[PDB]
Every structure is written in structure tokens, then in C-alpha cells.
Amino acid sequence: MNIMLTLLTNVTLASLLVLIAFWLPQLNAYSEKTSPYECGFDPMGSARLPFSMKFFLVAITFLLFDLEIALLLPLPWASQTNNLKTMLTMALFLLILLAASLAYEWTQKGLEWAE
């Protein structure tokens, strides 16, 4: 209940700042002023053209390594179990495979950007 009110207040303040910024000052908009900026000149092509990503392989690995965090964040609660040997074995086992997955992609030139 309180968090919804806080979020509403923050969003309302930001929107009101936008409204003040957009309705208080004098506006003189013409085509030259609103045109796209490339430091002195008209752009050759469109900004919506395909923009190559040279780190595309690391981007896919980030997806798999981000879910490693989901499996590891309950660890503080897992340390309170009675069978500490089993939990420690499985926690260490999970990180070892994460370390081995990083080592595999490193040694097979997966961390280097496309040329």
C-alpha cells in the first residue's frame, strides 16, 4: 500500500516536471531546428538501419549466466539447513560448472569480439 503511493508520487512528480518544462517556456519550432543532428550536416542514411553487434556471443552467454544468479541467491537461507555437507557440496558443484563454462568460452575464443 505504501509502496504504491511512493511509486505514484515519484511518477507524478516526474510527469509534472515534464509538463512544466514543456508548457512554461516559449517555443519556436521550425524544420531546421528539429532536424536530426550529425554535427554539421544531413545524415547520409537512416538511424534505423541495422547496427552490427560485435559482442553478440557474449550477449547470449549473459542470458545463461544471469540465471546462475537466480539459482545462487537463496544461498543465505540454504546455509541454515542441518545437512550442511550436502548443501555445501551442491553449492560448490554449481559454481564449479559456472567456472568451467566461462573457461570453455574463454579458451575457444568466445570472449573476443567479432572483427
Binding site: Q26, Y37, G40
Partner: protein, 156 residues
């Protein structure tokens, strides 16, 4: 009247805010830009007056034409001048920008940047000293202090 006093005080506030925060575009052309750099140097420290360079024209308030404006360059200067949101000011620095200067009779040189954009302050010299440019900037501040936009609107 009460409204006259209110609009006068509002003009005072807005003019103070605008002249106390003057952001020139990161924009220079020739020899003059070196003296602009030296006016940004620790000896004069324009940042202590509230004057900060910003690269984007959208985020800049002043353009300092510091150097020769050639024909090939004039459309680019006009473009970056136009993209500046208002209120905007232009300061012409050096003989080349003021009237063409030492390349006045050249085939490829614009004979003064006032043929392309309106100019508020003309700073003479070849190049003007960093102190002279600081004087021109303070003169521009004093000119901004004299604006009466809201008084004019109220008297309409």
C-alpha cells in the same frame, strides 16, 4: 501597478538565471579557439563565472564563432546555430569572424559571420586576448540583464 512590479521582478529573476548560467557550444574554427582555451584555462577560469562548454547544440546557450568562416563551412555553422534551442546568443570573436579579417578578399571566405547568423557581441582582435574574450562575455551578460520580455508582454 502591482502587475508591472510582478513582471519586472520576474524579468529580473529570469535574466539573472540566464546570464548566471551561460553554456557556450564546444565550437571553434581557427587561431581564436586557442585563446578561447586559454580563457578556459586556470588563470581566467570561465567556469567560476558559470560558463561551461557543452558539446551538444541542444544543450548550449551561446555560440562563439572563434575563427575564419569559409564558404564550405557556412552551411554547417548555420545548421548548428539553428539546432540551438532558444533563447540563444551568438558572440563573434576575432577579425576573421567579425568581417573576414586578413582573408577578407579571399574567394572562399565569408566576409563576416553576420551574413550567416545574427550577432550579439563583436570581440575585436587577431586574436583577441583571453581577457578580451572574458570582457566580451561579461558584456553579453550585461546585455542579457537588460532584457524586458515580460514587461513587453504585459504592455501588449
Amino acid at each position: 501597478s502591482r502587475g508591472e512590479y510582478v513582471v519586472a521582478k520576474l524579468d529580473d529573476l529570469v535574466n539573472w538565471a540566464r546570464r548566471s548560467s551561460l553554456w557556450p557550444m564546444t565550437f571553434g574554427l581557427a587561431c581564436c579557439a586557442v585563446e578561447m582555451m586559454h580563457m578556459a584555462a586556470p588563470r581566467y577560469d570561465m567556469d567560476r563565472f558559470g560558463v561551461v562548454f557543452r558539446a551538444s547544440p541542444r544543450q548550449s546557450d551561446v555560440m562563439i564563432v572563434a575563427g575564419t568562416l569559409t564558404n564550405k563551412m557556412a552551411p554547417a555553422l548555420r545548421k548548428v546555430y539553428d539546432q540551438m534551442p532558444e533563447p540563444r546568443y551568438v558572440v563573434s570573436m576575432g577579425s576573421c569572424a567579425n568581417g573576414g579579417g586578413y582573408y577578407h578578399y579571399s574567394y572562399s571566405v565569408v566576409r563576416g559571420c553576420d551574413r550567416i547568423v545574427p550577432v550579439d557581441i563583436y570581440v575585436p582582435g587577431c586574436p583577441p586576448t583571453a581577457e578580451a574574450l572574458l570582457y566580451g562575455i561579461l558584456q553579453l551578460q550585461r546585455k542579457i540583464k537588460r532584457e524586458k520580455r515580460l514587461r513587453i508582454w504585459y504592455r501588449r
